Chain A
Amino acid sequence: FCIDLLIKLARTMNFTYEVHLVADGKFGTQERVNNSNKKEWNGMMGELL
């Protein structure tokens, strides 16, 4: 569904794309981890930011 919609979005908006699966395998949540004492996003949300 989403790849067909992405091909449509690319064609109308005239951009090229490179698709890659998220390494984490997660959709994305804010996790403190506490290693850096600060919250960070994982999943696809982290990759975008």
Chain B
Amino acid sequence: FQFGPSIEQQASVMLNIMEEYDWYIFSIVTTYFPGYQDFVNKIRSTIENSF
């Protein structure tokens, strides 16, 4: 076990700081680093589940 953030919950904090300062305009830039599947999927999921 590790004292480390997850890729998903790091993306969750990214949207939290966007919400407080009202940054709703998005742009995802990723590479072939083996975590790009999980990073954008978590971000895409939260977009569709809020007013």
A32 to B48, CA, bound (A): 10
Taken together as a complex, chains A and B put the C-alpha atoms of A37 and B45 apart, in Å, by 8
Q: Is the interface of A mostly helix, strand, loop or mixed?
A: loop
The number of chain B residues with a CB under 8 A from chain A is 3
Q: Considering only CB atoms and an 8 Å cut-off, how many residues of chain A contact the other chain?
A: 3
Min CB gap B15→A, angstroms:
15
User: Is B30 an interface residue when CB atoms closer than 8 A count as contact?
Assistant: no
A residues near B45, Cβ cutoff 8 Å: 32, 37
> Which partner residue on chain B sits nearest A32 by CB separation?
B49
Mark A8-39 against chain B: 1 for CB-CB distance below 8 A, else 0: 00000000000000000000000010100100
B residues sitting closer than 8 Å to A (CB atoms) are 45, 48-49
